[PDB]
Amino acid sequence: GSEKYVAAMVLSAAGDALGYYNGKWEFLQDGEKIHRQLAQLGGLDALDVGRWRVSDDTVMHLATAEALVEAGKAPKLTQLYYLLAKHYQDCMEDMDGRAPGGASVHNAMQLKPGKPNGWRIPFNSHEGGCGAAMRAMCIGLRFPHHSQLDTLIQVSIESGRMTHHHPTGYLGALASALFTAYAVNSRPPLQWGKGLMELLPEAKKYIVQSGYFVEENLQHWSYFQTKWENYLKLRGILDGESAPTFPESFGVKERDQFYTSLSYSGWGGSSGHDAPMIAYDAVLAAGDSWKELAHRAFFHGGDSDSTAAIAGCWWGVMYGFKGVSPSNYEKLEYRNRLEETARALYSLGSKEDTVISL
Ligand SMILES: Nc1ncnc2c1ncn2[C@@H]1O[C@H](COP(=O)(O)OP(=O)(O)OC[C@H]2O[C@H](O)[C@H](O)[C@@H]2O)[C@@H](O)[C@H]1O
Ligand SMILES: [Mg+2]
């Protein structure tokens, strides 16, 4: 349904804005303090996002979505990648006060849309941030059909690699896009992690045949895979055939500690592996509760705008606006653009088509 695509785009942006709070909550490392301030504001249902700007996450996600819309039906990947690179480069003019990420901004300005392979960048050991994952969800809105899985894999990886040429970075884009497609198709969330694990060898097959920095990509592959395997084992969902099990003590402070344990270097949710992982952990626990989703994915001491942007997209696809206080989105920055782009993505994604690959 079109309304679920609208909710996916709008609630991803609402999550971003809520987990950002004009920077005040993004950069507060104490989840308990964030939750105290939330209560002082009146709780989530009382928050009005009219003055809560979206961050770079939404600006980039909209850039991905607009490129997908402009590429049209039965698109050529050469054209799509030109449009993606152009939109990523141009959207850096809309980052004032949005705390843009390092790899995202630097590499977007390096791109040369219009040269052949001009959106390709070298492998880099420090390009494992979540900036590719945070902007990839709508790739799954565009390519949700089983027949399009190879396109979803290729486009999510290449969109990611335009700024994050490191498997920890671009495999997060794959996870973000893939789980959105699963949500579109009503696949139960407890099956999603297993689906990602089964598709990682197909992602590797693409990277190898693509031929760029194969040795470096392979040398760094194990980190993302191992972190996800261990997380899925901890939750009891490695094979996709069990309800998840959560720890007995899993309040705000315990979640901050857990998110730090998942992190690469201490900031939970800031990398390609852990931004979608924390969003997924929130989805698994929250079911149809927007408030629980927010408490787990929007309001924590880590990189909360990025886990929120991912979680809000997946949740909106599944549940629409049901149980969401209107003040959480009615006056949201870019609401009209988000809704119009979502409707255009729906017209494309709901109509199964075939892409002309590279
Ligand atoms: N090999 C690596 N493996 C895992 N994580 C890494 C690696 N290298 C860096 N990191 C982490 O990658 C983290 C971020 O890398 P940055 O390049 O600044 O940013 P972005 O472009 O990805 O976007 C970050 C977004 O998240 C917020 O919402 C922000 O506002 C952005 O919107 C660093 O802390 C690194 O520790
Ligand atoms: Mg951000």
Swiss-Prot record:
Signal peptide: none annotated. GO terms for molecular function: ADP-ribosylarginine hydrolase activity; magnesium ion binding; potassium ion binding. The keyword Signal does not apply. GO terms for cellular component: extracellular space. Binds 2 magnesium ions per subunit. Mg(2+) 1 binds at residues 55-57, 305. This is ADP-ribosylhydrolase ARH1. It comes from Homo sapiens. InterPro entries: ADP-ribosylarg_hydro, ADP-ribosylglycohydrolase, Ribosyl_crysJ1, Ribosyl_crysJ1_sf. It catalyses: N(omega)-(ADP-D-ribosyl)-L-arginyl-[protein] + H2O = ADP-D-ribose + L-arginyl-[protein]; alpha-NAD(+) + H2O = ADP-D-ribose + nicotinamide + H(+). Belongs to the ADP-ribosylglycohydrolase family. Its EC number is 3.2.2.19. One of its GO terms (biological process) is protein de-ADP-ribosylation. PANTHER family: ADP-RIBOSYLGLYCOHYDROLASE, ADP-RIBOSYLHYDROLASE ARH1. Pfam families: ADP_ribosyl_GH (PF03747). It is an enzyme of class 3 (hydrolase). The keyword Glycoprotein does not apply.
